[PDB]
Write a structure and sequence with these properties.
Blueprint: E1 25-28, E2 37-42, E3 47-52, E4 57-66, E5 71-73, E6 78-81, E7 86-93, E8 98-104, E9 109-117, H1 120-129
Antiparallel strand pairs: 1-2, 2-3, 3-8, 4-7, 4-9, 5-8, 6-7
PDB class: protein transport, membrane protein
Keywords: beta sheet, protein transport, membrane protein
Assembly: monomeric
Amino acid sequence: MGCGASSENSSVTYVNGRPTFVGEEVTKGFEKDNGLLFRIVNKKKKQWAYYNDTTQYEMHVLVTFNEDCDIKALGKTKLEQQENGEWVASVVVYPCETEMFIEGRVNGFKSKMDALPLSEEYRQHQAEKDK
């Protein structure tokens, strides 16, 4: 319609590493830097996926969906409904790694992301990767 600003200079380019998951539609959450976090969505399985690029900041995903939404929880993503009638799904993704989020149909939802510093939990996660 106009937008009034330039977007998607050219597909998507990674630096720290490429995502181990590929869907169809790709977009960047934060409008700063290479992109930090790229939202991966596969129309086929309709499963969402997040890939962390930054190796100094952990990506935290917090998306809320409306009651009327056929969505599911993937990986260890915690999914629960509130009394008001809304679905919540949160999951943290560590750098050089990719985790699954939610799957299904999305209807009226709010997305909130941030860039927190690799907490002590990140250090422990390294042990899980190998020992």
